[PDB]
């Protein structure tokens, strides 16, 4: 999990350049994936606000068109959030499988 | 008003994973139709750009062939845009009825 991952990163301070590539990639991917999510959450807040401020003057066709953008964003945001959970699992399993070799078996 | 709009829009967005199939169909038809439109808009942008960059070297007959090809895309793009408006108005009625059931059960 997260404690083990922290202890793992904190142990590789001695050779951060020699930290596994598979992990360097998964940590960089989660950072990116979180930025995409927060950007979608923000887009959703803006789109929602904009809908609320103008809904009286929007015709049925143009309300639906605005609702597509928010739906599409709201689903892509859920898609990222779900992808983050599955990636965070794999990474914690990758770390626990690493520790079992490094520290439990002792190489 | 605005509070109610925010309320109905949340309830709506918290029900995207499970909408009536009539809506799932119509939103996917719009996703398709929108993709055709954006593809035409892009084709039009390219054809227009191409015309502008080469018009000096094009003969009158060639200039017309290029412009005629732009009219065909520009009209097909309008044809899609018009179909989207009709499909969206039909979907607003679906969205409205769904929200009414949704909120009636939640109440």
Swiss-Prot record, chains A, B:
GO terms for molecular function: chromatin binding; histone H3K4me3 reader activity; methylated histone binding; zinc ion binding. One of its GO terms (cellular component) is nucleoplasm. It comes from the Eukaryota. Keywords: Acetylation, Activator, Chromatin regulator, Chromosome, Metal-binding, Methylation, Nucleus, Phosphoprotein, Transcription, Transcription regulation, Zinc, Zinc-finger. Coiled coil: none annotated. Component of the HBO1 complex, which specifically mediates acetylation of histone H3 at 'Lys-14' (H3K14ac) and, to a lower extent, acetylation of histone H4. Component of the MOZ/MORF complex which has a histone H3 acetyltransferase activity. Through chromatin acetylation it may regulate DNA replication and may function as a transcriptional coactivator. Inhibits cell growth, induces a delay in S-phase progression and enhances Fas-induced apoptosis in an INCA1-dependent manner. This is Inhibitor of growth protein 5. It comes from Homo sapiens (Human). The lineage of its organism: Eukaryota, Metazoa, Chordata, Craniata, Vertebrata. The gene is ING5. The chain holds residues 1 to 105 of 240 of the full protein.
